[PDB]
């Protein structure tokens, strides 16, 4: 009958979303608004919201239901629609000039295993608002949850009158189909949301490519910060979706003056402090791999789970695992994506800033600071040059939750569009009405 | 004090990298002083006219008095640091700021079409955004490009700028372009040229902006002002000898006004060719062995072209006109010459459809002349070009006779449009949670 | 071509107590978050967009005022509830450089006194309250006596919803007996920081002579110009739909046609084709003018907002419900041209050229600088009359209500300020601009 | 050629009436040329200096060196035609443009405090908007305003402007100010002065912009850079001898750092009066029987104010500093003298609430020196002034040391804020139904 959006071949998946895009060029702005709203109701439906949130966890073995229940709702509510497509206007003696945001064509989107449903909802809303179709390439670990969402969207858009196959994917998401999608001529723009290997891959294809890379965000806490509030926002921001967010705090850098009071307020807020060098080393055997990287089995796991594996039984109060280590520690250097939070002590905030730049590894992604000194907040904000910089709040404030602005799950650091929206999936066009319609 | 011109490619890259790391420690007023310095170098009449002849002399393309306007339009209507605006959103959750920060060192590739205009354009926009620019000019514009880079480097040193903000190579060539592409220390690539260099910077694993080519059609219908349309068409097509990426390249005339349009094209300096044999002869000259325009004719005047087929002509003639079918290579192949075929159609509604077809999905430039709002709306929306000019010459889309700012790096494939300082900057967010909400 | 182309309830017995209660409401509103404002604005929206009260509020205004029709007011009440800007209208400007960061913000005014008309009684209460409360203000309403009960009723459902949402009491207040005296009482109260007048030229003249900041949304007399290049078929349909909209009550609705002579006759045919009753007999035209005009040359109160079928019945002409307006071709000095009848009566004046049309439309506008419409296809003539007539709203090739967001691009409003320069008023129009300079800090670029 | 100055108010208005009609036929480039002409007038060095001595000498208020900075600030950072932005939104129902269009003839009433800065600032804003301006300046600054207007007409005459775009009366007074406000052909009033003239223009049945007065307090808290705070408060309070409506007029310092603040304020040229006998001598000198400021002392230097009480000191002194209770008249009155009282409070929240109290709900200007981003936000969000400067001099709220544009007409009651060209324009909406939606 109607297409379910899922095809057996990447080539005809691209050819199907290529025909959809052209048909989609006949649909009015109001059609886009109904389609965009149709995608919101699909995920914000309470039966679907709870279903995608827990099933993703069931299939990926990462994150938790309660938090992807919030993240999925953030992608549905705070993702911009067709209002994002603004129009610049310049009226003068030479008439008028309009600048619009117009469809690219067909977009290929490569989505991660840390925000499988969130990224698809966030991409599809923006890419369809800008008048594009999208060919998705999900991470094969999130294959089942992603295609089902792809299918749920196709059904809703069919009931609204949309052209078939505005959102599509493949039945067997693989590394080969992802490469196949990057090579297909009809694909006009690529959007990559993942690690450094995939971001550099879409940049080598001869096509327009949005690159959302990895992070390693430090959170500086100087003597000026509200230590009680700082330690609360840290635990919440680090335990959020079990540290899967690319913004989630992954190492603490505190000045010696307030460090012991920070650790005390951190434990008070649900941190389990590891002080014995043996159980710490015992923890490194659990969560690390060969080549000193993170184990995907431990990635996205809870603090209850990780301490269960080293013979420590704690209740549900424990949200993170705390330890004060040197800066060379692998938990500091690596993007653990786990509620494991090291803490490096430094003499002054200037040393905390100069170190936070180093452990950023030039990712230019996310950095957090707790401090009420404007001069010190703007010195770190200027020097580290990250795409998102949160101040006196949990890191998820930079995604629109607890912070001002809209929400996105594709954050462009390398290619540099920042928090991508519908403007990011559109071509910039200029229209010059010479010596007419200067009605000032 | 360095001159901004280095012996090898790795030397210029490593010096711009040290420059931008030092450029970061500057203020916005320093950026504004260096921006004005770049404007001063080209807008100086002594240098302006030197840059306009050397480009015509060395490359052998265009004329000097039109490059006089193109070089001026670049240093005059290019956005400066005022292009870097700030977005703010305040409420219960605090204050959000969105800024345009530096990328780092930018590698820039320029065409033989507009050597100096593109250097002036990229320098202002990239340096205003806090970047440094490593230019890799075409070998056929080498000596004028190196002269302009040194004049800028000289000027900026007298303003207190860190050295090597604008750098280039002593021996520009194809392989120096490829060494700038592979250099890990280049953060952004901007390419203003053919379709092969654009896909090459798009295949290097780097952030790349590609300003592609086109084939701009101009549609005329029974509703247009025919006298002003034929003046705007000849002026646009013959601007800098049809070198600009925006200049008209073929006409599509509604049959109802096609004859009266051909008369007013003549009255405004168009030389029509009616004998099919003399129209063979120019196909022999400008089109070469296997169907592509010949680089020796590209950028030459209409008088120079008519002389090569033995037609001595006064400087009144600005273009070579001919009524011709839609399959003739003069309509399909981007000539970049003051040769302007015309295709006659019955209707305006597939005058539009024919224009979309001959544009060849470049979605670059299209022009239309008329009085009906719905018809200008219909063609401007369906053809989906980056620039669409209504009731004026093509260069009106460059800030010359139209509203908006000026650019010589118009990104088609990569979607930035008329690139400016913002186009060469990283969008960064800054969230002050639960503070600075002063409403 | 001759063818064209193809807990308090909110209501107080005295005016002063309404202001004193609205001032106390301002004190407490300043302690409420933007989310509270958003929930209170969203509260008002549910008040009018709830289908039962939506039908309910529409029949009232027709029953109490005798003006307009029910189905079109069902459209105007929904248009105010949906397309009026909320707290998203309060945007922020930011400037960042070497000297730090400067923000400019829209901040509340305090207590606002709003004077509403009888032609749009509930639409203006919805629209004023949304933007005024979104900007962080409290509003005192002085309704027109003719639409007393429908206005009093809406303000009570508003005070009930907001209370149920935890809003400070008396955020939106009014008087128990609206009167011109209670209007002058509001104009003179020192606690009222701003005035907003939506009515005739006399009420706008008053608010600007009180010693307070005032937004004056005055009257209109919009002409509609059709030249030989217009889509005459579409022109006639838009003109009849726009003129008859809510029985010509809107300040935007068409009031007189200025048609180029070449297409004027074909235009009339397509006006009749779309439900215009053409009056040719000199005598029966006198009957309507004797019925519609008063001794002072102004419109008849008992006839304002009455249907075209109702007006034709009173002169002894029975017609079916397909007739929406009344059409007569008359000279330019005819009263129906010079007066804002606010009735489905449409005069047409024929002119030689489009140049003459643009000039007479300027002459007929009466310097209201409010609304003007022109159906035309040439960009140069559209540009000429738009730039020249200088109206607050200018509509091209559409119905007049496209300047309200109905079939046009933008937000809706029912307070359209011309002589005071605010344009189509929204939350920004009801707020003060504040500049916050952070010297040599927060420049993070 | 007319010089713009007329014998009667009615003759000036009618001249500005017909001039504004003729103005409506001019282009944006024409407006741009006239605006730049008014910039060149005041920014000319000899004219910049001339205006500044002539004002001080004719009014007896302010100092030369600071009115040099301020007159430069009005011609250099006042918005031009770039201030008149266009809004636009397109979709299915077509295109909608929003534009800023001129009112008509505007009447502007300038004050003695800044006679030249307001004429330069007003005239640039209202001509940029396409309006004409009839000026009714203060009689105390009578000949400096007519010479400034005359010099302006000569410049506009040379540029090709319609005669009498900026006009004034030969004999300024308040009698013809009323004539201006009661003239049918004036369309907006712009009153820049005290609370009387503001309510006067708002009672005329006409659109009016009223820029009232204020009593700006500056709050210092324990987080403030005391060496930098004490420096900025002296530069800001003694700026033009406290004449600017923005200039600090009383300090509210927390007890923790109040003595070290006064310690560092004297390093910057403060004179502490500790003997109530000497202090009362100032009181009887500068206040009035009913406690108002004395016109003879307004704008007088601190050196001169101390000479009227015998105390002789050099020009190193810039202000007269006194620690004093809150109810004292120096705190409560907009003195516009370099007299700066200090009110010590215990906590920053006492300072915040007190600065709210002494501001008298003028909601005009307030300053705060502090490093805590929470306290800066708390006072800004509560005092609700149209200018709020943080960690800098008062005049940083007028583009001199801060971000943004400058103005000299600050609308507090009427709510326009820092009036620019946009303030003197009507918003018009232009709806193209079902056309020009080319997205
Ligand atoms: N900046 C952002 O917006 C953002 C958002 C979510 C996740 N991430 C990052 O993703 C990373 C972890 O998620 P992940 O496990 O899905 O990483 P991942 O790179 O393994 O997977 C991302 C996607 O890219 C594909 N991919 C990866 N390598 C590829 C290759 N060599 N060739 C072709 N395709 C390839 C994968 O199939 C997958 O679909 C983290 O580093 C996180 O920072 C970034
Ligand atoms: N969109 C714009 O802003 C713009 C402006 C001017 C010209 N153009 C286009 O550029 C073309 C004319 O300029 P051009 O002849 O110099 O184009 P081009 O193909 O030569 O590209 C310009 C640069 O690319 C380099 N280059 C080209 N091929 C290369 C290769 N195989 N390997 C390494 N480097 C290579 C050249 O060294 C040259 O410096 C036209 O197509 C015109 O439409 C576009
Ligand atoms: N510009 C706009 O946005 C807009 C919108 C709707 C209606 N209007 C105009 O309103 C008028 C129709 O409404 P109306 O019948 O209520 O007219 P109206 O002028 O009599 O109504 C003005 C309101 O203020 C009261 N009022 C009238 N004159 C007053 C006076 N001299 N002093 C004090 N109060 C006075 C009235 O009781 C009424 O409540 C039309 O002229 C229409 O153009 C304008
Ligand atoms: N808000 C601002 O932007 C701003 C700017 C400069 C000065 N001011 C204020 O102005 C005052 C200092 O200047 P000033 O001495 O000229 O003030 P002022 O009130 O004495 O005079 C202002 C102008 O308005 C006229 N005027 C005053 N009262 C009038 C009345 N009742 N009727 C008719 N005309 C009247 C005066 O003739 C004069 O031209 C201070 O209070 C200062 O705060 C405010």
Numbering used by the authors:
A (entry chain A): 85 to 524
B (entry chain C), D (entry chain B): 86 to 524
C (entry chain D): 44 to 49, 86 to 524
Paste lines from the article.
Here we systematically reconstruct a part of the metabolism of the GRM3 of Rhodopseudomonas palustris BisB18 by functionally and structurally characterizing three core enzymes, and by reconstituting the reaction sequence in vitro. In summary, characterization of the GRM3 AldDH leads to a revised and detailed reaction mechanism for the ubiquitous (present in all three domains of life) family of acylating aldehyde dehydrogenases.
When AldDH was crystallized at pH 4.8 with propionyl-CoA, we obtained crystals with triclinic P 1 symmetry, diffracting to a resolution of 2.5 Å. We used the same condition to co-crystallize AldDH with NAD+. Electron density in the active sites allowed the fitting of NAD+. Interestingly, both co-substrates, NAD+ and (propionyl-)CoA, occupy a similar position in the two structures but with their adenine rings pointing in opposite directions. This was also reported for crystal structures of the AldDH homolog from C. phytofermentans, and is consistent with a proposed bi-uni-uni-uni ping pong mechanism, in which the aldehyde would bind to the active site together with NAD+. A conserved glutamate (Glu419) forms hydrogen bonds to the nicotinamide ribose, which appears to facilitate the correct positioning of NAD+ for the hydride transfer.
